């Protein structure tokens, strides 16, 4: 039982069928977009039907318009049939087998230098405007005029906004560890803090066990130990926007008295559903959609300029120590340290077809 997504143009002449709404990027390769286009012969007679894959960065309110920077464009012909227009994939030949003699296959690939689906809409107290990276699979019909000018009617076009989702690679970095120490004003003794995680890559919805070791040699009391998951977002194309937002939070029940040590392990789960406010964070889809999760960690391929990624997303554990009698008397700064990590989806890996609309389901 395989669900297949379809969309018909306004004039009923071109229909797209795709086997997936989200295509998988596991660093090594990127899943190609294979699908089929169903044409009405009488309506595409004398016309040519193409399918294009565009990836673009957008900044501003969409409609003059806003800011757009194209990052990858590819276009393929689907009608009339090109060469031995037999299927390339089992999905394609099964779809042609099911849909009939007017179905033509297409396959558009992703290069190895593109970002994944990332979008953001600012909050009231945020300065920058909404921005994102869109992936558009669009099939359209083209005809000519006796005044030597080709036309592309929107009514003969179908536009799909797919997602390029980031999945974990085969490898994984070293275990993330950090040690920080503070020597506060007028005190000889140091406050020390060691933080470790279990692994370097976590999956969306997987618990993160932050292990914390506070070594308090000072005369002061560590009033509180707070552990956070912070998402850091850098718009690196049109405006140099910057966001730090808290996605998970956990307080320790214990205090660390002067001249003692404490080792605890707190567990956090960074989830979009944790946050009632979905504005101001980096997502992989629109706020209105139930498909939407937090954006995955940006993975920059070696040799590629980070500005071509449009929006950079990173994640870090943050440990905040509230020390008694310090703030307001000995400092106006925070006592905290960071441990970076990466957040993705897990590693990857005749049918009967059920057809559904490509339009993504709203949240409500
Ligand atoms: O119909 P058009 O002119 O081609 O453009 C569509 C339109 O902007 C819809 O509002 C949008 O629905 P969403 O709110 O779900 O984004 C859809 O995205 P879609 O590809 O998911 O259908 C777009 O493609």
Q: Compute the number of strand runs.
A: 20
How many structurally independent domains? 2
Question: CATH first level of the largest domain: which class?
Answer: Mainly Beta
User: What is the number of helical segments per DSSP (H or I, 4+ residues)?
Assistant: 2
**CATH architecture descriptor of the largest domain:** Sandwich
| Helicity level | under 10%
Secondary-structure element series: EEEEHEEHEEEEEEEEEEEEEE
Bound molecules: D-MYO-inositol-1,4,5-triphosphate
Q: Note the beta-strand portion.
A: 35-45%
CATH topology of the largest domain: Immunoglobulin-like
Largest sheet, described in full?
Answer: 6 strands, mixed
Radius of gyration: 26 Å
Q: What structural category do the secondary elements indicate?
A: mainly beta
User: What is the terminal separation in angstroms?
Assistant: 27 Å
Shape category: elongated
GO biological process, one term: signal transduction
GO molecular function, one term: phosphoprotein binding
Family: Belongs to the arrestin family.
Subunit structure: Monomer. Homodimer. Homotetramer. Self-association is cooperative. Isoform A and isoform B interact with RHO (via phosphorylated C-terminus).
What's a concise summary of this model?
Helices cover 4% and strands 45% of the residues. The relative contact order is 0.19. The protein folds into two domains: 2-169 and 348-357, Immunoglobulin-like, CATH 2.60.40.840; 177-344, Immunoglobulin-like, CATH 2.60.40.640.
